[PDB]
Amino acid sequence: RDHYDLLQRLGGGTYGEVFKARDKVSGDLVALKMVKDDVSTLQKEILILKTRHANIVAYHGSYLWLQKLWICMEFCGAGSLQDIYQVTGSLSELQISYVCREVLQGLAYLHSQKKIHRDIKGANILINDAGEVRLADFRLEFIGTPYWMAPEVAAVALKGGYNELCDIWSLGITAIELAELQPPLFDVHPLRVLFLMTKSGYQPPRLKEKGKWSAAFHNFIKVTLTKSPKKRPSATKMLSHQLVSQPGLNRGLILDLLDKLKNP
Numbered sequence: 001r002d003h004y005d006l007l008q009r010l011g012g013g014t015y016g017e018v019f020k021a022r023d024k025v026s027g028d029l030v031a032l033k034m035v036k037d038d039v040s041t042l043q044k045e046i047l048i049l050k051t052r053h054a055n056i057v058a059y060h061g062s063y064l065w066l067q068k069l070w071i072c073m074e075f076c077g078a079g080s081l082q083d084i085y086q087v088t089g090s091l092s093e094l095q096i097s098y099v100c101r102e103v104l105q106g107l108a109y110l111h112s113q114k115k116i117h118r119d120i121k122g123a124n125i126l127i128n129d130a131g132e133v134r135l136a137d138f139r140l141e142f143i144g145t146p147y148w149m150a151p152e153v154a155a156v157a158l159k160g161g162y163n164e165l166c167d168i169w170s171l172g173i174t175a176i177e178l179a180e181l182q183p184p185l186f187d188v189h190p191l192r193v194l195f196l197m198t199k200s201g202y203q204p205p206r207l208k209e210k211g212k213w214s215a216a217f218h219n220f221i222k223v224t225l226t227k228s229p230k231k232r233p234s235a236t237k238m239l240s241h242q243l244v245s246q247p248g249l250n251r252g253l254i255l256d257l258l259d260k261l262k263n264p
């Protein structure tokens with residue numbers, strides 16, 4: 001409050017209470033997230049956030065003022081991939097490929113720290129001005145969006161049991177999302193989507209157009225969208241997949257996309 005100047009509410013309830021702020025001593029842009037009772041318990045949860053990955057939005061500081069918690073993070077100028085594709089349209093196969101590798105690297109770190117993101121979706125993958133892909137590491141708000149749920153997460157509403165492998169399924173849905181501007185079954189009732197997953201003969205989703213994509217992209221979708229969690233590969237195993245281990249994958253693919261965002 002006394003060090004930063006608030007400028008713009010970001011998310012519109014999607015993120016919660018996020019603010020685009022400017023430092024009075026640096027002038028640099030930051031993201032301030034306000035979280036809705038004890039003093040000693042609050043200072044313990046912050047210390048663990050400073051100990052930091054290339055594909056994770058970096059922590060800056062925390063502020064406990066008048067019953068409000070101010071989580072400070074880095075500002076990704078372009079916003080989320082969803083904000084980007086609402087202007088640029090669908091991403092190229094190589095753009096999606098690079099985005100998947102970067103998300104998979106962030107998930108490898110998160111899952112190694114015994115954490116589960118649980119919300120991997122287009123609107124939760126941020127792209128900074130530098131063309132870098134970053135995820136966010138954080139009675140409470142139920143985390144999860146029906147269309148991006150793994151079958152073991154949807155079924156959890158009857159016969160519980162899920163693990164870090166759900167983020168692999170969510171990344172699979174997000175790959176289809178970045179290609180078709182909508183997840184599979186976006187047009188179908190969320191209970192019906194999460195009900196058809198719980199029935200026999202269930203077929204995991206694929207890209208609508210077969211001819212528009214390569215067999216490696218089609219295999220990445222087949223492999224990440226494995227119905228069985230036991231057979232679904234780990235984030236590190238996925239990193240060696242033909243699609244995300246291609247040689248042309250560089251940050252420039254996103255500097256191209258960010259240029260289309262500026263002037264299409």
Ligand SMILES: Cc1c(-c2cc3cc(Nc4cc5n(n4)CC(=O)N(C(C)C)CC5)ncc3c(N)c2F)cnc2c1NCCO2
Pocket residue numbers: 008009010011012014015016018031033057073074075076077078079080083119123124125126136
């Ligand atoms: C990802 C996340 C965050 C989170 C968000 C951030 C956003 C940014 N920058 C930007 C830049 C923009 N937008 N956002 C979106 C946006 O509204 N517009 C508007 C102006 C149309 C376009 C330009 N920068 C940093 C962020 C950061 N660190 C965060 F943690 C907080 N809470 C969460 C989640 N996940 C789901 C629920 O909880």
